[PDB]
């Protein structure tokens, strides 16, 4: 419903926050991306704890290789993983 | 209803016959064939409707029987002038509850 | 007054009147709440 | 082979059967084919085949499995083809036929499958085939035909049997997931359409099945949610849901039992996302359905407790000789009472028992009564007394107790509440013994549940009576023989206490206990977040339960039953029933505790904070302050006063911080919760007129501090301040409405009985922090006269919103909410107490003050017309709606007419721009299109801003105008009509109308008391149109009829004027029709009309105006995600 | 007394049933007690309460409700002397109730009190006066006598129910004197064979 | 902190609740999805006109060819719809 609309709105809010946190126009540098991540998902997600994972995620997110992430890429993949977690939780765990 | 039978679901059916002698203006009632003390006297030229007041207690509530005992005319003969001397019981369509 | 009237006259026209409340002979019988069963506690008798 | 062939042939024919849509369309070929198939296969033969029984496996031959050879016998798949043919070809449409086939052929099959569901038989080939046959052919058919089940009371026993059987099969194991889904869908489909009273027995089973909250229990949650949501009317309304009767006492008892069982089990159980999300709707539904004031006939303080049928242990304990004497006495009494039953049945003594003979050999005196039968009669009594001893029930002889039967009479002897309860538990033990016997029988049979296996208490009252007769007989014989027995009933200790026993009472008590738990774990969470951050969170279970269940439950319950909590005993606002003073007290306690819980701790709640605040709003709405203030515990009184005082402290703390981590926390807490919740509380107080009673003493002092701090903040200037201004203004307006002290009129305060100074003694209010003089309560607030003179001066100056941002946003709402509340308290108002001695009014407000005020607001808006952004304007209009009701008539000529006229001129100019743009094409058209769009948007904003006041004014003065002709009113009609003409002409204007009403979240119907009918412009035109018709002459209606035709022809305005001019002598004739006669009569009866219709130019202009209005009114009334 | 019989119903005669058009009449409540007013079909039953059956669509004042096959809150209660104007528009199949010349509105804000009415036999003015109540039914035989007709309804084109009836409209009331009547052939409970 | 988790859990609640009432308790069938979208978005969706459009979009959205919309697929599509809404925001001018 409008609640799901507000969910997309929250995604957009959090994105634009860290896109301008370091001033990277509207696109997440490696540092913006890291800080973003450990801010939004405290717990299940790791960037400081897993810097090699952060680097591999930099490469994977930036298939284009730009090193910056716009809205499409992370929305797709991050939404997929973050929702599929609970689907697995119900299924088995 | 007998006092002993009172308080029990009776397996029998009760029959109450109401007799009116028009010439004498007299009315009597017989329960199951046994005469009852209750009697009434009415003034001449009075009109009386057969009637029954009942609180339903079973699917089969009551039945108006227009019969005739020995040497007593049925109700239809009194009710309709044409049948004034006909002794065979009748229930023409006009007669209804 | 008239008895069991459903119509009345009035300034603008006829008034239709609904059924009237009627007093019953029993209404005159004074019925207080029974109190014989009640027995006075001593702390209430001294106040009595 | 032969069964297989015939089944395959029938299946083939059924598949050949035409589709339902073709049958409905009536295709002759399809109907012919269906007729051929019906002739080939007789229906009765299909019913017989479905009826035919299937051999089911048995545990015979020394516990072995006798499974029929599937390939060599009659199999469910064979019946599947028959069912398919019966559905596709013959179809089921008659309720009687449905019941007939269901009973004869299907119901036996589902009974057999349920029976075979046991462990040994679970995996048998025949059992699996039955599951397949059912879930593939039978269950879907019943689901499709479910609606036919309405009004089936005549076969209620069979319907209830079907429901029980289907539920048992659903629980059955070894089912595939699809099979279980099909069965569950059938269950919901049946329960949706079946009558509520039917569900009594099924719901009774569920009361015991669900509370365990196992995996198999989830579907019942949805089932109960749907059923209770659908039938809430039938369960709570005293009258009962239309045509469906009313709930029964036992049914309501089952409802309460189920509610509390689910509540307790959910609270105890650890977290589970799916289970909690499924539960919360269910708990809300039962909470709504159950009556607020319902009281159970029987209450169990002990609240004892797939099923446990083991009886209460009695054999372990021994029997005293005293109780043995009682055993002999009750044995002879029971023998005598049995002989009395025999004499009632006409049975007598005999040599042997024979029904026809009606004689009995044991019908002999107790002296000759055989010992074996004597032991038979005594042993139940021995067990009962041993059960009493095991339960620790102690029986003491006060005195010894006192063929042709001679039974001691028990009707005269009664039983206290204790003894009635004891009879209940004795019947429970007897029923448990019965269930133990049934348990041995079911063990031998290999499965199943006896219908009476369900707990005794859950059993219906009449069914409970069956064991209760013997239980209560034993209890009364104990009493007569002199046994006094008592265990110290906590039930009697609680006493009847109907108020405490009301369901709402227990619900609220549990809520308060959970509230204490909330305080505890919020303190723990605050400590851990402050320091020693760690993730254990032992209360985590309680936190999740609170947030997920209790808060939504609070919201739903206190929204659905707000009326019951507010209705006073004297006056019942709701449908029926009124809460107790104690119930109101716990409501207030909950409100204060929740306010304290959320105080300064909103960030901790986070995503749950909005739900918490919604619960605050609902509790504030349902709160009844007047009763608690008049009478209530000093502790709850102090809780409410402390909430008010802390709110004042928080808002003043705002004020100074705003003037310039804890500060930011306070800011966000006040912005999110305290201000809106306080606003809602004040609004409720104002609506219910509770202000005089509730706002007193310390409450008044806190309200003064809040008001004056808000006003000082408003006077202060800052960007974040102007951000906060709207909410502050709304809150202060509500506070002004609630306030029972004329703060704006200190000079006359002494008259006000309801004032802090008058109530408190001079010796008092010095110990308190109260200024000696009322003027110093706070001097910052100006007096009413100076406020009025100022606001008039600024209005005349016509300065800008930026010039006076504080005024419009705060002072105007304050003052427009102030005048109405104090107008009645002041003079010049209906004086109901005129005959009695009336003290001089505390306020001096008069209608002229309100009139001047309204003229001022009109002046400010008219001055501010045309500005790019005036979002404050809509809030000002809504806040100013209330005053307009008492506006004096001359306002229309002084302010409205020029005001709306300027807007009419602006509309003309902007539409002129629109036609010029239309003439412009391509890039010329595109440029300036957004321009004209913006002008339309700002004009629409101003237009909505102005109307609601105008609408409410019209409502008040329409009587005057329509009673007596008014040239000014006629001019206003012309003007509004022209505006509507522009509206109808310009499509861009309409779309921008919709854009504004949607974007600005305007509730369009609220102003009247979103669609075109809801659109204000058409609403305004309709509201004024009667005046336009009235000012016209009845005769001229034919001219309007012709003018509307010309407008349909799309002729120019001058063209239609000239048409009427040349057709001027086409007037209607009074002699022509009679209606015109009484039209003419009324028209003449109204004065001043002898001068009407003197000029044909007047006639034609009037007709043209009205026709232009009606034609466009008729046009109005009657006309990327995928990408 | 029995509540099914407690309130007297006064309706117009059956021969005045209106099949089409827009009709108006007024009902002044000389007392604030329980009183219903509206439009009933010609086959209205004396014993059944108004608006508790499909036959009648009415507005009850003392509580502020609209009754048809039950009850639903609607409008506001009247005070003594208030005039309820009842309007029926058969071209639109709607019924409107106005108080003191102002159109009453339901909770949803809809102006029409009742909607989607099938003409059927017709419609007649009807009122029900609970015990101890007095009302005044103006059917517009004298158009000037109406109080709020000009304010509301006149411009809308509604007609006084008896605007052109030279003789006063005849009324039938629910006489509460029991009398014997033949057992209905379709009586739900009692069957005579 | 956990605001994206809040948005994600709200998403889960909404689409699971919209799946269960209408069909199989968890996944997204065609009818489930049609009524779901009706519940979800108004004034923006163009699929309201035809349910057959919903059907064909379901067919594509079920590249796995099962007739049931997977949670990951649905979330990625609604992320693309977030993309479309951000494009709407920029187009506004
Ligand atoms: Ca960036
Ligand atoms: Ca990239
Ligand atoms: Ca699904
Ligand atoms: Ca798929």
UniProtKB/Swiss-Prot annotation, chain D:
<comment type="function">
    <text>Cytosolic calcium-activated calcium channel that mediates the release of Ca(2+) from the sarcoplasmic reticulum into the cytosol and thereby plays a key role in triggering muscle contraction following depolarization of T-tubules. Repeated very high-level exercise increases the open probability of the channel and leads to Ca(2+) leaking into the cytoplasm. Can also mediate the release of Ca(2+) from intracellular stores in neurons, and may thereby promote prolonged Ca(2+) signaling in the brain. Required for normal embryonic development of muscle fibers and skeletal muscle.</text>
</comment>
<comment type="similarity">
    <text>Belongs to the ryanodine receptor (TC 1.A.3.1) family. RYR1 subfamily.</text>
</comment>
<comment type="subunit">
    <text>Homotetramer. Can also form heterotetramers with RYR2. Identified in a complex composed of RYR1, PDE4D, PKA, FKBP1A and protein phosphatase 1 (PP1). Repeated very high-level exercise decreases interaction with PDE4D and protein phosphatase 1 (PP1). Interacts with CALM; CALM with bound calcium inhibits the RYR1 channel activity. Interacts with S100A1. Interacts with FKBP1A; this stabilizes the closed conformation of the channel. Interacts with CACNA1S; interaction with CACNA1S is important for activation of the RYR1 channel. Interacts with CACNB1.</text>
</comment>
<protein>
    <recommendedName>
        <fullName>Ryanodine receptor 1</fullName>
    </recommendedName>
</protein>
<feature type="repeat" description="5">
    <location>
        <begin position="306"/>
        <end position="402"/>
    </location>
</feature>
<feature type="repeat" description="6">
    <location>
        <begin position="403"/>
        <end position="507"/>
    </location>
</feature>
């Amino acid at each position: 419903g409008s609640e799901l609309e507000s969910a997309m709105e929250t995604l957009i809010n959090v994105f634009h926050a860290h896109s301008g946190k370091e001033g990277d126009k509207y696109k997440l540098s490696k540092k913006e991306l890291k800080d973003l991540l450990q801010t939004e998902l405290s717990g299940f997600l790791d960037v400081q704890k897993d810097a090699d994972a952060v680097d591999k995620v930099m490469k994977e997110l930036d298939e284009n290789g730009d090193g910056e992430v716009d809205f499409k890429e992370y929305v797709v993949l991050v939404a997929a993983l973050t929702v599929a977690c609970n689907n697995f939780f119900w299924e088995t765990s | 209803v007998s006092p002993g039978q009172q308080g029990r679901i009776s397996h029998t059916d009760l029959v109450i016959g109401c007799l009116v002698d028009l010439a004498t203006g007299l009315m009597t009632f017989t329960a199951n064939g046994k005469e009852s003390n209750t009697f009434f006297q009415v003034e001449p030229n009075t009109k009386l409707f057969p009637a029954v007041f009942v609180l339903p207690t079973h699917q089969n509530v009551v039945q108006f029987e227009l019969g005739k005992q020995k040497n007593i005319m049925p109700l239809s003969a009194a009710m309709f002038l044409s049948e004034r001397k006909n002794p065979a019981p009748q229930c023409p369509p006009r007669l209804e509850v | 007054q008239p008895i069991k009237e459903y119509r009345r006259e009035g300034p603008r026209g006829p008034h239709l009147v609904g059924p009237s409340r009627c007093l019953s002979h029993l209404d005159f019988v004074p019925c207080p709440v029974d109190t014989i069963q009640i027995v006075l506690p001593p702390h209430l008798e001294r106040i009595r | 082979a032969i069964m297989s062939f015939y089944a395959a042939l029938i299946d083939l024919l059924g598949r050949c059967a035409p589709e339902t849509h073709l049958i409905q369309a009536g295709k002759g070929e399809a109907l012919r084919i269906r007729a051929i198939l019906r002739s080939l296969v007789p229906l009765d033969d299909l019913v017989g085949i479905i009826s035919l029984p299937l051999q089911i496996p048995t545990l015979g031959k020394d516990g072995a499995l006798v499974q029929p050879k599937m390939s060599a016998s009659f199999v469910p798949d064979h019946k599947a083809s028959m069912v398919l043919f019966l559905d596709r070809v013959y179809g089921i449409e008659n309720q009687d036929f449905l019941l007939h086939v269901l009973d004869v052929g299907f119901l036996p099959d589902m009974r057999a499958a349920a029976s075979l569901d046991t462990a040994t038989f679970s995996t048998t080939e025949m059992a699996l085939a039955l599951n397949r046959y059912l879930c593939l052919a039978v269950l879907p058919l019943i689901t499709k035909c479910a609606p036919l089940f309405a009004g089936t009371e005549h076969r209620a026993i069979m319907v209830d049997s079907m429901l029980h059987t289907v539920y048992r099969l659903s629980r059955g194991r070894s089912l595939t997931k699809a099979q279980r889904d099909v069965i569950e869908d059938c269950l919901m489909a049946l329960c949706r359409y079946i009558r509520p009273s039917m569900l009594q027995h099924l719901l009774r089973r569920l009361v015991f099945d669900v509370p365990i909250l196992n995996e198999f229990a989830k579907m019942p949650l949805k089932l109960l949610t749907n059923h209770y949501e659908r039938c809430w009317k039938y369960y709570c309304l005293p009258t009962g849901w239309a045509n469906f009767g009313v709930t029964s006492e036992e049914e309501l008892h089952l409802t309460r039992k189920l509610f509390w069982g689910i509540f307790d089990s959910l609270a105890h159980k650890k977290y589970d996302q799916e289970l909690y999300r499924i539960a919360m709707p269910c708990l809300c539904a039962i909470a709504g359905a159950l009556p607020p004031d319902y009281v159970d006939a029987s209450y169990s303080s002990k609240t004892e407790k797939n099923f446990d049928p083991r009886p209460v242990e009695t054999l372990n304990v021994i029997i005293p000789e005293k109780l043995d004497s009682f055993i002999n006495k009750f044995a002879e009494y029971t023998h005598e009472k049995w002989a009395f039953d025999k004499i009632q049945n006409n049975w007598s003594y005999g040599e042997n028992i024979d029904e026809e003979l009606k004689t009995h050999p044991m019908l002999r005196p107790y002296k000759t009564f055989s010992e074996k039968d004597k032991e038979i009669y005594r042993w139940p009594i021995k067990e009962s007394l041993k059960a009493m001893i095991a339960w620790e029930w102690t029986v003491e002889k006060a005195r010894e107790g006192e063929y042709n039967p001679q039974p001691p009479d028990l009707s005269v002897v009664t039983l206290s509440r204790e003894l009635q309860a004891m009879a209940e538990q004795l019947a429970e033990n007897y029923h448990n013994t019965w269930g133990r016997k049934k348990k041995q029988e079911l063990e031998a049979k290999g499965g199943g549940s006896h219908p009476l296996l369900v707990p005794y208490d859950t059993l219906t009252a009449k069914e409970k009576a069956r064991d209760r007769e013997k239980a209560q007989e034993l209890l009364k014989f104990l009493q007569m023989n002199g046994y006094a027995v008592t265990r110290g009933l906590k039930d009697m200790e609680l006493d009847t206490s109907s108020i405490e026993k009301r369901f709402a009472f227990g619900f609220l008590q549990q809520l308060l206990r959970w509230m204490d738990i909330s305080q505890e774990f919020i303190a723990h969470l605050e400590a851990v977040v402050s320091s020693g951050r760690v993730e254990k969170s032992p209360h985590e279970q309680e936190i999740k339960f609170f947030a997920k269940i209790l808060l939504p439950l609070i919201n739903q319950y206190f929204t659905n039953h707000c009326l019951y909590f507010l209705s006073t005993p004297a006056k019942v606002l709701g449908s029926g029933g009124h809460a107790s003073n104690k119930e109101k007290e716990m409501i207030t306690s909950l409100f204060c505790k929740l306010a304290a819980l959320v105080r300064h701790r909103v960030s901790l709640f986070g995503t749950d904070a909005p739900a918490v605040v919604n619960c605050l709003h609902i509790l504030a709405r349902s709160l009844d302050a007047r009763t608690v203030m008049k009478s209530g515990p000093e502790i709850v009184k102090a809780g409410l006063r402390s909430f008010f005082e802390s709110a004042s402290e928080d808002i003043e703390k705002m004020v100074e911080n705003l003037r310039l981590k804890g500060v930011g926390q306070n800011l966000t807490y006040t912005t999110v919760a305290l201000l809106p919740v306080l606003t809602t509380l004040f609004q409720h107080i104002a609506q219910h007129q509770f202000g005089d009673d509730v706002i007193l003493d310390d409450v008044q002092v806190s309200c003064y501090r809040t008001l004056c701090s808000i006003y000082s903040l408003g006077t202060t200037r800052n960007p974040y301040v102007e951000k906060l201004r709207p909410a502050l203004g709304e809150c202060l307006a509500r506070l002004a409405a609630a306030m029972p002290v004329a703060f704006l009129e200190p000079e006359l305060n002494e008259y006000n009985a309801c004032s802090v100074y008058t109530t408190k003694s001079p010796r008092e209010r010095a110990i308190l922090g109260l200024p000696n003089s009322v003027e110093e309560m706070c001097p910052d607030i100006p007096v009413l006269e100076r406020l009025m003179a100022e606001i008039g001066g600024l209005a005349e100056s016509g300065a800008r919103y930026t010039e006076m941002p504080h005024v419009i946003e705060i002072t105007l709402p304050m003052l427009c909410s102030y005048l109405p509340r104090w107008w009645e308290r002041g003079p010049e108002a209906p004086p109901p107490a005129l005959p009695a001695g009336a003290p001089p009014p505390c306020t001096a407000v008069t209608s002229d003050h309100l009139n001047s005020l309204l003229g001022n607001i009109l002046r400010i808006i008219v001055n501010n017309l045309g500005i790019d952004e005036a979002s404050w304007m809509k809030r000002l209009a809504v806040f100013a709606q209330p005053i307009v009701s008492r506006a004096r008539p001359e306002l229309l000529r002084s302010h409205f007419i020029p005001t709306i006229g300027r807007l009419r001129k602006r509309a003309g100019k902007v539409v002129a721009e629109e036609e010029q743009l239309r003439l412009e094409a391509k890039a010329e058209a595109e440029e300036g299109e957004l321009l004209v769009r913006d002008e339309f948007s700002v004009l629409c904003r101003d237009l909505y801003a102005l109307y609601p006041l105008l609408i409410r004014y019209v409502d008040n003065n329409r009587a005057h105008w329509l009673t007596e002709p008014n040239p000014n009113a006629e001019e206003l009609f012309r003007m509004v009509g022209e505006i509507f003409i522009y509206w109808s002409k310009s499509h861009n204007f309409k779309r921008e109308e919709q854009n504004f009403v949607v974007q600005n979240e305007i509730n369009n119907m609220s102003f009247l008391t979103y669609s075109v009918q809801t659109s204000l412009i058409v609403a305004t035109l309709k509201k004024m149109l009667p005046i336009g018709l009235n000012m016209c002459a009845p005769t001229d209606q034919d001219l309007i009829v012709l003018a509307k035709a010309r407008y349909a022809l799309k002729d120019t305005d001058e063209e239609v004027r000239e048409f009427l001019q040349n057709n001027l002598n086409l007037q209607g004739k009074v002699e022509g029709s009679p209606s015109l006669r009484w039209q003419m009569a009324l028209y003449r009866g109204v004065p001043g009309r002898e001068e009407d219709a003197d000029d044909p130019e007047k006639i034609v202009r009037r007709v043209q105006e009205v026709s232009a209005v009606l034609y466009h009114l008729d046009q109005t009334e009657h006309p990327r995600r995928r990408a | 007394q029995s509540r099914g019989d407690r309130a007297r119903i006064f309706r117009a005669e059956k021969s005045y049933a209106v099949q089409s058009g827009r009709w108006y009449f007024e009902f002044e409540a000389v007392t604030t007690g329980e009183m219903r007013v509206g439009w009933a079909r010609p086959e209205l039953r004396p014993d059944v309460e108004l608006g508790a059956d499909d036959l009648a669509y009415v507005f009850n004042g003392h509580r502020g409700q609209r009754w048809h096959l039950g009850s639903e809150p609607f409008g506001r209660p009247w005070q003594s002397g208030d005039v309820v104007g009842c309007m029926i528009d058969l071209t639109e199949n709607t019924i409107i109730f106005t108080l003191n010349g102002e159109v009453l509105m339901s909770d949803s804000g809809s102006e029409t009190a009742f909607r989607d009415i099938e003409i059927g036999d017709g419609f007649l003015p009807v009122c029900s006066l609970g015990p101890g109540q007095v009302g005044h039914l103006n059917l517009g035989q004298d158009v000037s006598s109406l109080r709020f007709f000009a304010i509301c309804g006149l411009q809308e084109g509604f007609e006084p129910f008896a605007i052109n009836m030279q003789r006063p409209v005849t009324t039938w009331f629910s006489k509460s004197l029991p009398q014997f009547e033949p057992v209905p052939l379709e009586h739900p409970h009692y069957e005579v064979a």
